UniProtKB/Swiss-Prot annotation, chains A, B:
Lipid-substituted positions (S-(15-deoxy-Delta12,14-prostaglandin J2-9-yl)cysteine): 521
Region (Epoxide hydrolase): 234-546
Induction: By compounds that cause peroxisome proliferation such as clofibrate, tiadenol and fenofibrate.
Gene, per the UniProt record: EPHX2
Cofactor: Mg(2+)
Enzyme class: hydrolase
Designated name of the protein: Bifunctional epoxide hydrolase 2
Mutagenesis or variant effect for residue 102 to C: Decreased phosphatase activity; no effect on epoxyde hydrolase activity
């Protein structure tokens, strides 16, 4: 029956309500109870506050009208306002104190996910204060999670006028009885109730959510912890930079603040960072999530040596040159992790800080060919299978959906070992035709990867593994250096290839290294433990890169 | 005969030379003359400094080797180093003091423009200091102006070893006698001279440039002031954001720091900002230069109302939402200028600061239809011609090259008046078939616009003028507001349509308005007076938007 959910902002989606601050301010300054709420509301539908809420004047123009109203309420009440009474000061503090009320937001999210149309309906203002950015961020953060945001100052109408409710029903393309509306103000519910909407008077959050869960029949309270926000590819800003004449790099870009360049591994995509991108942007960074060379919408030339670490690094440098970035933070996973360490080694001046998920930094051994070194570890046998051009391509492109569904699995869901792949003659020889869907990924997400890899397949991606000797020779030039810029190594407990112990000597080469560690996390770290990744990165960025 | 020009960095392209700082430091601290230059150079080809310059160790690893060398030189000289002697401190100060030597850079530029291949050859280091970004910026700024930058620490070789010169001749694909090389160190010229290169020992800049002008036969000294750096479209990062399902916006993106969104007028392009984009990026901003809706690589739907100011503003807001920007600085010219004022009026919270070139802010007259208002000014007659769908399209698309060559002209070069266009029956009725090339633009630049407008022609662009009534109605909602965020108005003296006096009452509506004014500047402000525009914007940004 209920198909729409509408949330007030002040006192419902954002807390403390700013009305509650007029309460406290009165008491703090020992004024008459309600004097500040009277001056606020003076003149009703024709008073300063209604003109503000309808968008007729800006917040800076209203401030001095509210001052006047305070002089007038105080005179008629026979008190005096304190010396240094400041309306600007009180509202600056009140607006900056209000935050997103997390459990209401997650209830709105969850209803959106069970198919509800959702909106925010709020009486708000055109904010032109020096400090307006604070509110602009808050509204951006809430708004990406709703179908609509209706603002009184944008539509020229206010709660509780009956016209804004009709504009609501009309925006939602629904009838009064298919809508629930939560607001902390009884007067605003009054007209929604008249048209026959379910309403919930919002006092404490939990009681409201209990009423909401009862009326919608969907569980909202005590729900398990939700995943971080993901990205819809077609909602993103897509960037293209030609780094040399046959080669363009594609990236997805979100946020402002210090540049953070995310570098995925094999065989992945910018999209492997889908759970990090909104969180890092929201934490105050400019995220640039790459399609690395060979992948997705970046170019994929066929030659093996277009993919040695040297050319790849030089090209990531050019990428920064053309974008006008003197530095970025480099964060990599798997092959990306390898590349960011070498960015730190050869271009420290372009690298603000470096982090790797799973991939340790282990200096080249100048007295052993890197092929022998790879033979010394049975878990790396899949790299030998990758060597011969064509063979792995034929297997991995033969069935894309099967390929990614087999690969992208949590640590208890495995359907292949990395074990004597050469001898068995294939990566998938004894694995299912139609693997079951891992709990980590939806069918839709697999199909995004499948669609990416239809552009260029696995040649360019496998070539990252076909420059052992050339990479070894380059790396040997760096064997006198140390990494002395800020650096983070994150190990994954149940990565059975890139195991945590392989990182154990890293401090010899990176004496100030910081570490995170994630338990119960396989190889696909970002989508296995997104919440934990987000927390470790954001904390390390705020302390080391900011 | 000479086909290549090679510039040293320290003491040639950047000044003061850091070698000169060892001089001063010795005197400042009253040490033995040359003690600091001896410790620096200790051990020759096998000493700490050569390993640094070849890239074997990083700058942070060398610092304490130089300390040791200072202890050793001081002991053998029988002096003591001051308490608080700090190698890090001295080099931090010396590196931050060195700047681009402007006249050498402009000589290199000019030689590049007369067809020379140019490079920087420098002994430099892998800089991993906390403060490394300072140097990274400098190198980025120089490097975009040369064919090559060869760094000793990247190639594993140093001046004056003869191997780096061979690597030079080889990178330049030229023979020893087709090359001039300037360096402040005689020893480095010595081997270039042996292979038969022209060399110039660089002491004071002017004497060197005189020698360079003599040997190349190109005038370099006392040249007229050069234009600011322009943009090559295929060297830029190109951004795409879908703001609703039929509509994507394209932009070109350069720089980091606060977001600055540039909004061109009719009938133009992101490229109309080509002279502002590198300067604003270099000044510390993140520039986003739009193709506005209707143009270039942005979508151009056919319907007139897709182009009213309201829809356009809402869509620029969505553009910020998807990019993750809570604010940007909005800078507009002509129609763009109009749009940014309305951004300031209706979305102050998303606008960090607003500037307009030429377009004044003049509030809608609620008692006069805007068509009558347009009839009241004979210089706006071209807007009436624009009204009827098809008529202006047919004229302006008929010959693109003629169209832009006729339009894009300096104030003394006019070939059309905006005067009784309707009566004459065309904008170009009495103008040349093949206009001469204005001094403002090259043939190549016109052809860029021509190629842009082949994608969608003039429908979407003209539609910006076909919403007079709808724009008027929207604007009337704002007639109680003021613009109280930081705002700049720049007038152009010889814009005969958007004349400076039309801006004269702006302070009534924008009481804190700042102003620039550009003399001898027609309608095409950015390309008419780029140097002056850059200076007025950058100064206003640094004081009001930063
Ligand atoms: N646990 C793991 N560590 C590393 C892995 C890399 C890998 C990815 C794809 C193919 Br096909 C084979 C191996 S999987
Ligand atoms: N001096 C000027 N002010 C405004 C101008 C706008 C304009 C641009 C293109 C065509 Br076609 C006609 C007029 S030209
Ligand atoms: Mg409320
Ligand atoms: Mg020098």
């Amino acid at each position: 029956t209920l198909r729409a959910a509408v949330f007030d902002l002040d006192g419902v989606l954002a807390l403390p309500a700013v009305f509650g601050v007029l309460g406290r301010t009165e008491e703090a300054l020992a004024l008459p109870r309600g004097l500040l709420n009277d001056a606020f509301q003076k003149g009703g539908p024709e008073g300063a506050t209604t003109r503000l809420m309808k968008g007729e004047i800006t917040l800076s123009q209203w401030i001095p009208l509210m001052e006047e109203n305070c002089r007038k309420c105080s005179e008629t009440a026979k008190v005096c306002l304190p010396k240094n009474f400041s309306i600007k000061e009180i509202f600056d503090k009140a607006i900056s104190a209000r935050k997103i009320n997390r459990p209401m937001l997650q209830a709105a999210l969850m209803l959106r996910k069970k198919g509800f149309t959702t909106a925010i309906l709020t009486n708000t203002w055109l904010d032109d204060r020096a400090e307006r950015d604070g509110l602009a961020q808050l509204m951006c953060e809430l708004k990406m999670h709703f179908d609509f945001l209706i603002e009184s100052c944008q539509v020229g109408m206010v709660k509780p006028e009956p016209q804004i409710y009709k504009f609501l029903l009309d925006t939602l393309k629904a009838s009064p009885s298919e809508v629930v509306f939560l607001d902390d103000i009884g007067a605003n519910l009054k007209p929604a109730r008249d048209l026959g909407m379910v309403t919930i008077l919002v006092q404490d959050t939990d009681t409201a959510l209990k009423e909401l869960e009862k009326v919608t029949g969907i569980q909202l309270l005590n729900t398990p912890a939700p995943l971080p926000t993901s990205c819809n590819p077609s909602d993103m800003s897509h960037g293209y930079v030609t780094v040399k004449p046959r080669v363009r790099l594609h990236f997805v870009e979100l946020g402002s603040g210090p540049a953070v360049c995310l570098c995925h591994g094999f065989p992945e995509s910018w999209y492997s960072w889908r759970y990090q991108i909104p969180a890092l942007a929201q934490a105050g960074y400019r995220v640039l999530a790459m399609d690395m060379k060979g992948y997705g919408e970046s170019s994929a030339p066929p030659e093996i040596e277009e993919y040695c670490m040297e050319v790849l690094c030089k090209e990531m440098v050019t990428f920064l040159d053309k974008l006008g970035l003197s530095q970025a933070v480099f964060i990599g996973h798997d092959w990306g992790g390898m590349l960011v360490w070498y960015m730190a080694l050869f271009y420290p001046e372009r690298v603000r800080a470096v982090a790797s998920l799973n991939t340790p930094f282990i200096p080249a051994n100048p007295n052993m060919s890197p092929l022998e070194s790879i033979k010394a570890n049975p878990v790396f046998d899949y790299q030998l299978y990758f060597q011969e051009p064509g063979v792995a391509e034929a297997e991995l492109e033969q069935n894309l959906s099967r390929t990614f569904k087999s690969l992208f699995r949590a640590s208890d869901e495995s359907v292949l070992s990395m074990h004597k792949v050469c001898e068995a003659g294939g990566l998938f020889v004894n694995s299912p035709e139609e693997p079951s869907l891992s709990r980590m990924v939806t069918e839709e997400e697999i199909q995004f990867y499948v669609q990416q890899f239809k552009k260029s397949g696995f040649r360019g991606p496998l070539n990252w593994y076909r420059n052992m000797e050339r990479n070894w020779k380059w790396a040997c030039k760096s064997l006198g250096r140390k990494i002395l810029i800020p650096a983070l190594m994150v190990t994954a407990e149940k990565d059975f290839v890139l195991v945590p112990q392989m990182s154990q000597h890293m401090e010899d080469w990176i004496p100030h290294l910081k570490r995170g560690h994630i338990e119960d996390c396989g190889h696909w770290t970002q989508m296995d433990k997104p919440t934990e990744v987000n927390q470790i990165l954001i904390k390390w960025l705020d302390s080391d890169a900011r």
